[model samples]
Target: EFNVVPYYSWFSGITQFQKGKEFEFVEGQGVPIAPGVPATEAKGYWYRHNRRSFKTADGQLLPRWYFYYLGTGPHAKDQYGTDIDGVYWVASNQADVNTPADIVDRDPSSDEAIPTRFPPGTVLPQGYYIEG
Candidate 1:
């Protein structure tokens, strides 16, 4: 008998690897956006090889781990988007720090709590298609 290994995830990204070998592992840090709120709790942070040696004094390649996060928020819309109130899984990597001139059209206007489930066929302006 033979064994096989598989890899998968909801999001796709790169992993650090050496010459045909897995690189060292390091823990990332997290920051709370809604510090005391349980239902609306959110966190954001990034981690990578803070101090990695990819080469020596000669500026050559070396066996090292090179990982990084290309996004801004972990679960919030960037200020420049129209759906600022829409809770998301992650921010786009290309998002930038919003400016005062930025306008959001679909901002949440109500302080109403979240429902157990969005109504069927509910489509938010941000393109979220809820099927109930």
Candidate 2:
């Protein structure tokens, strides 16, 4: 299980949660598995994507963090994949938990937009990657 840290900005509502923190995740929204390679015939990794719903303690879902777990297979060759430590924030204005993983855009267009990464040395879990 991964940890997430919730952050709030008075100026811009709530920003995305920082993963690998002390917070507890309610449930995994979806897992998008990458397609297998026809040439190598190797299976790709499974990405567990989820969005956090900001609540008022009464558990009313508002809107919050967008993150996912990037799994690595034996043949996975990405930098983050080699260590099986790839965690990323889904960049978007608001992401629907049940929406398609590829439906979101990650370009930085505003200050409120979640950054692709934190400052150097932010010590993440095994996976250390970001989405933009």
Q: Which candidate is the best by TM-score?
A: 2
Q: Which candidate is the best by lDDT?
A: 2
How far in Å is the alpha carbon of 118 misplaced in model 2? 36
| Model 1 whole-model lDDT (C-alpha atoms) | 0.24
Candidate 1 matches the true fold with a TM-score of 0.17
The residue-by-residue lDDT of candidate 1 on 1-132, one tens digit each, is: 013321111112222333433321122211112223232122222222122445557642222111111223222233322342222222223233232212211213333212213223332223221111
Residues 63-122, candidate 2, lDDT per residue (tens digit)?
233333222222223332233333322222233323223322223334344343432333
List pairs with backbone clashes in candidate 2.
3-20, 3-21, 85-126, 85-127, 85-128, 86-127, 106-132
lDDT to native, each model? 0.24, 0.28
TM-score list, all predictions: 0.17, 0.21
lDDT measured at residue 94 in model 1 versus the true structure, 0 to 100: 29
Q: Candidate 2: lDDT over CA atoms? A: 0.28
Stretches of model 1 off by over 4 angstroms after superposition:
1-15, 18-37, 47-50, 54-132
